[PDB]
Design a protein around this ligand. Structure first.
Ligand SMILES: [Cl-]
Ligand SMILES: [Cl-]
Ligand SMILES: [Gd]
Ligand SMILES: [Gd]
Ligand SMILES: [Gd]
Ligand SMILES: [Gd]
Ligand SMILES: [Gd]
Ligand SMILES: [Gd]
Ligand SMILES: [Gd]
Ligand SMILES: [Gd]
Length: 258
């Protein structure tokens, strides 16, 4: 055949070719989330778009280094230092610091989330941008763990619409990774999702992350078609573009035949 036949049942992931000035990194938007609310973020509609109905706190652009690793303070005999969760013990102390005098269960203010001053104990954030595959093939995105609730979505009309990165969130709940905190309690370290991508196309990427209490954690990785893994620092892979709703040709519904 002179041409490829295309993915079966138009199953290729939609991608984009935005024509404007590319910027390195993802945009991060921050939204209010209530301390100790362990229910709101267990709903798919909230995690897909509902988060943006709460007050927007602010934003930071140009972020390439995207994993979350937030540790609450331990107010200790020798001063105040962040405590790795695995080093916390008793009621409570932090290994190497002694007993901590402060509550685990209050809000704490910090810039650790992308330099933005907020409460990482209780917040929801939305990361948007475009993933640029350097290689054609299967990419496997993963969260190593999820504390508390998160989704990852890849593709036009799944993450967001082409050339419209800055618009209000779309309603798609067809998540690439569903790390939504279960009602039942529990969940494993499905957690991963696979997308077949064609080199040189821009794939919309959305990550929505929430925490209700204390520690927050979301280690983000992707396994490339060559079997190597990129973790935390996605520089060279993620980009933003200012909205251009007028760019008629921006959406590529089927990169497998374009
Ligand atoms: Cl601290
Ligand atoms: Cl100790
Ligand atoms: Gd990092
Ligand atoms: Gd951190
Ligand atoms: Gd940690
Ligand atoms: Gd940080
Ligand atoms: Gd669409
Ligand atoms: Gd947490
Ligand atoms: Gd592999
Ligand atoms: Gd803009």
């Amino acid at each position: 055949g002179l041409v490829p036949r295309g993915s079966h049942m138009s199953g290729a992931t939609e991608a984009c070719l935005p024509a404007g000035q590319r910027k390195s990194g993802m945009n991060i938007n921050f939204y209010q989330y209530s301390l100790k609310d362990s229910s709101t973020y267990s709903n798919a509609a909230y995690m897909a778009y509902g988060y943006a109905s709460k007050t927007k706190l602010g934003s930071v652009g140009g972020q390439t280094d995207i994993s979350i690793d937030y540790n609450i303070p331990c107010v200790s005999s020798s001063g105040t230092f962040p405590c790795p969760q695995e080093d916390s013990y008793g009621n409570w102390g932090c290994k190497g610091m002694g007993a901590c005098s402060n509550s685990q269960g209050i809000a704490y203010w910090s810039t650790d989330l992308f330099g933005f001053y907020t409460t990482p104990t209780n917040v929801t954030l939305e990361m948007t941008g475009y993933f640029l595959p350097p290689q054609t093939g299967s990419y496997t995105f993963s969260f190593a763990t999820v504390d508390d609730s998160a989704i990852l979505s890849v593709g036009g009309s799944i993450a967001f619409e082409c050339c419209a990165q800055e618009q209000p969130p779309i309603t798609s709940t067809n998540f690439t990774i569903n790390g939504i905190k279960p009602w039942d309690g529990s969940l494993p370290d499905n957690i991963t999702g696979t997308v077949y991508m064609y080199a040189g196309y821009y794939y919309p990427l959305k990550v929505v992350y929430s925490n209700a209490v204390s520690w927050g954690t979301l280690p983000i990785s992707v396994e490339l078609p060559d079997g190597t893994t990129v973790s935390d620092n996605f520089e060279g892979y993620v980009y933003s573009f200012d909205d251009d709703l007028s760019q008629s040709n921006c959406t590529i519904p089927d990169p497998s035949i374009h």
